[PDB]
Amino acid sequence: ATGIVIPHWTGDVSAQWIGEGDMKPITKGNMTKRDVHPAKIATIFVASAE
């Protein structure tokens, strides 16, 4: 009933082929949060007690 929140990934992470003594590269991710809230649907119906 609180809803849900989802961390959608969006980052281009990248790796490199590297020589024996070569200097290894630095990388970083990326995200955007998305949230889902419930909603109600309802109806009423009616009759005589007879």
Binding site: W9, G11, V13, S14, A15, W17, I26
Partner: protein, 297 residues
Amino acid sequence: TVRANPANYLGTMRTKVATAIAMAFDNAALHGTNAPSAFQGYLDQSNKTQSISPNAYQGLGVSGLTKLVTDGKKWTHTLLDDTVEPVLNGSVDANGRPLFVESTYESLTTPFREGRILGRPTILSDHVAEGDVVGYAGDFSQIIWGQVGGLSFDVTDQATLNLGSQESPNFVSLWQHNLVAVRVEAEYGLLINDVNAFVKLTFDPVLTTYALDLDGASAGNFTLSLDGKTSANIAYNASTATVKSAIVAIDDGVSADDVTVTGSAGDYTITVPGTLTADFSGLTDGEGASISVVSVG
């Protein structure tokens, strides 16, 4: 941040670097974009190419396959970019009927799509294409690969990192800035036995350019051979116009409009439609000489 681990960012990076490392294997094996010197050759080096856009069934099944079987080589798999599928479906007879009733399917466990084409296993994927090339077809048993143990993770809070390059440094001390770094490492080997065993697939026809090098003892003769048909003998010292004449003289008769030649005696660039090959057996050095495809661009 490492205390908080928001959205499980640290555990998520450890899987998404593995995908980056997998992606970086294909681009090193197919296109060779940033391969290590230890990888011997890559599929873009092949001297066989084919067009598909007017009729993909003719392309893969006849004009393409002929270049393999007339050279004595098998066709066993194909890799296609997702952008090929509209052109594949768009292949029709001259009454508008589809040529591929044979068709391709999803996976519950992998992001690819997979199926059969003319009986061969076929993979469709979102990143096969680069530049002019949209896929590959050939004998994938000519390729072997291996991995040296598991994907490896180290963590440190004491190291000093260069955020620049070795030509223009920019250091940060992790310990003085209260930072933490994770270092991820893997190790693979690849060999392609015969790069000439595969056909590069493209939407529409192009000329192929070749570097021809006779570095070696400077007397004797060689034969060119274009689309499996072989020239007369060409001497070591032959001119560009001599070579152009010796190519067009082959009896499928590609025009002096199609062929072009540049360079000097003993060192040439050739541009032609179709597959070019050479045999140096008849030079005084039949081993130093070579021919290869120019990665033109």
